[PDB]
């Protein structure tokens, strides 16, 4: 992996220590030829939260365009999910977005849809 990335199971990961809005975080990863982390499995989920706890951390999952999509094209419906109970609930807001449309990993690792303008830590992921 490149300098200051973490190699794990054929992927390289970069963990921020500061926050961006979801789309700014995804744009940052794309400029690193990466994407916001796409969590493909329980094993990857455990790896991610070991490193991100206890901050809400953006991952590459969003329903901004009308349904749940992973930023790298991974099929959402059929694949690994780790939603917290009663999530996603699409909570309606105003100041940080009209509705919760971007996914964060909670301290317990479970996923929550949140407002896309929340300034959270993020993780980039690309293949080694």
């Amino acid at each position, epitope marked *: 992996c490149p*300098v*200051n*990335w*973490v*190699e*794990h199971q054929g992927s390289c990961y970069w*963990f921020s*220590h500061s926050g961006k809005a979801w789309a700014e975080a995804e744009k940052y990863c794309q400029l690193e030829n990466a994407h916001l982390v796409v969590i493909n499995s329980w094993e990857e989920q*455990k*790896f991610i939260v*070991q*490193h*991100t*706890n*206890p*901050f809400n951390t953006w991952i590459g999952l969003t329903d901004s365009d009308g349904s749940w999509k992973w930023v790298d094209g991974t099929d959402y419906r059929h694949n690994y999910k780790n939603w917290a109970v009663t999530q996603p609930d699409n909570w309606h807001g105003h100041e940080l977005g009209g509705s919760e449309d971007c996914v964060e990993v909670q301290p317990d690792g479970r996923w929550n849809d949140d407002f896309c303008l929340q300034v959270y*830590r993020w993780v980039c992921e690309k293949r080694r």
Partner: antibody
Amino acid sequence: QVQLQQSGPELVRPGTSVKISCKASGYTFLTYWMNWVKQRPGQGLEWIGQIFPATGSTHYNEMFKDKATLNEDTSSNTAYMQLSGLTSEDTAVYFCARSRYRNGLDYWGQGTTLTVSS
Amino acid sequence: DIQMTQSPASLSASVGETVTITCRASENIYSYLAWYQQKQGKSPQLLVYNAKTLAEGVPSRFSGSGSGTQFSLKINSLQPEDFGNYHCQHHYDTPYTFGGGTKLEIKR
């Protein structure tokens, strides 16, 4: 070359608190876990906890949750462990050691001897 | 919470002999097992991780094996720098735990 340099020996009284440092060089401090291990005289090793400096994420052995607090100074590549409410059972050598997730402790500091005694 | 059990507690051997020390985990840890060497008064040094992978610069005479709950470290044709204490440690889910150690002692 990878090197982990720990602070020098400590001799303190019970009920006090001590801070042990471990300065890392020769690798990217931010991308590895820093682990802390305890070894009482003549005994085996005990894992205290670990910190991931890039995020500050910490994981502790619950046996040490009240005893040890880990933190990091990113600007100086230094990991710290605070040991508090000290008693003679804290007398031991303490090591820092580097690891990656789900991997071994691949480089160790030289150890810091802590003696707690009235 | 995983208990690691090492045996024997002490093993006497001579240079050039082959020895095997063993480690048992109280539950499945797959291949997430490391072995350390520790010489008196010094810090441990990683020998083996992922149960069988030699760490950088470790001599090929060291051989780790096992998965699941039963593991072994074998030292083929021991050299004088091999005497000291050996420790196993699972590196599965935190908290890590260590075996109680095995002293490799000089036979006479």
